[PDB]
């Protein structure tokens, strides 16, 4: 029950994906900021 | 059944009741799909009964340890 964008582009997920965001302190900062704003969608 | 009664039966005896109730639910669901169920309230009633039984069982096992 969601919306998916390019569910086959692997490079999209390897650049802007959740596991790449969680692999460095700066990406975790990005995720923290987006959680603070209240975004419905975190990362790709 | 009310908890009081369920609490009187032996653990094994409870397990059996649960088995039986689960069969009733299976049948009830199949009847609904075909189109031969009138008391649809029976479905919900059975589900809650199964829960009441499992609650009593766990409470006895926690008490043990």
């Amino acid at each position: 029950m969601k919306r998916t964008f390019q569910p086959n582009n692997r490079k999209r997920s390897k650049v802007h994906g959740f596991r790449s965001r969680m692999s460095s302190k700066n990406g975790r900062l990005v995720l923290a900021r987006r959680r603070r704003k209240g975004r419905k969608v975190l990362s790709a | 059944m009310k908890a009081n009664e369920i609490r009187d039966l032996t653990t094994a005896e409870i397990e059996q009741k649960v088995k039986s109730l689960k069969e009733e639910l299976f049948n009830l669901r199949f009847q609904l799909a075909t189109g031969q169920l009138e008391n649809t309230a029976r479905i919900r009633e059975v589900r809650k009964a199964i829960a009441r039984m499992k609650t009593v069982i766990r409470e006895r096992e926690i008490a043990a340890n």
Binding site: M1 | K19, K22, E23, L25, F26, F30, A33, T34
Partner: protein, 93 residues
Amino acid sequence: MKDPRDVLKRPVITERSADLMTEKKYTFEVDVRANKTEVKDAVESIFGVKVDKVNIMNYKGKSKRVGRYTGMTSRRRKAIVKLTADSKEIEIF
């Protein structure tokens, strides 16, 4: 699975299903995490028949709408059980 009655959810009653039922094939809605052998054994136990083959599909959810709001329906798992020359699951349809 723990109790086989958790593998089978409800039968499927359509025109295609009624067509297949005359070839001794029955269509069920199945828990989305159950596999072929699980369904085979559950049908064995519940109805006391002999099972020859099982085939399974996966179905995506459909987009629906009621007024202004939009959503999706649940995913489904469908199984077509082919019985051998044995008894007949009475679905009492």
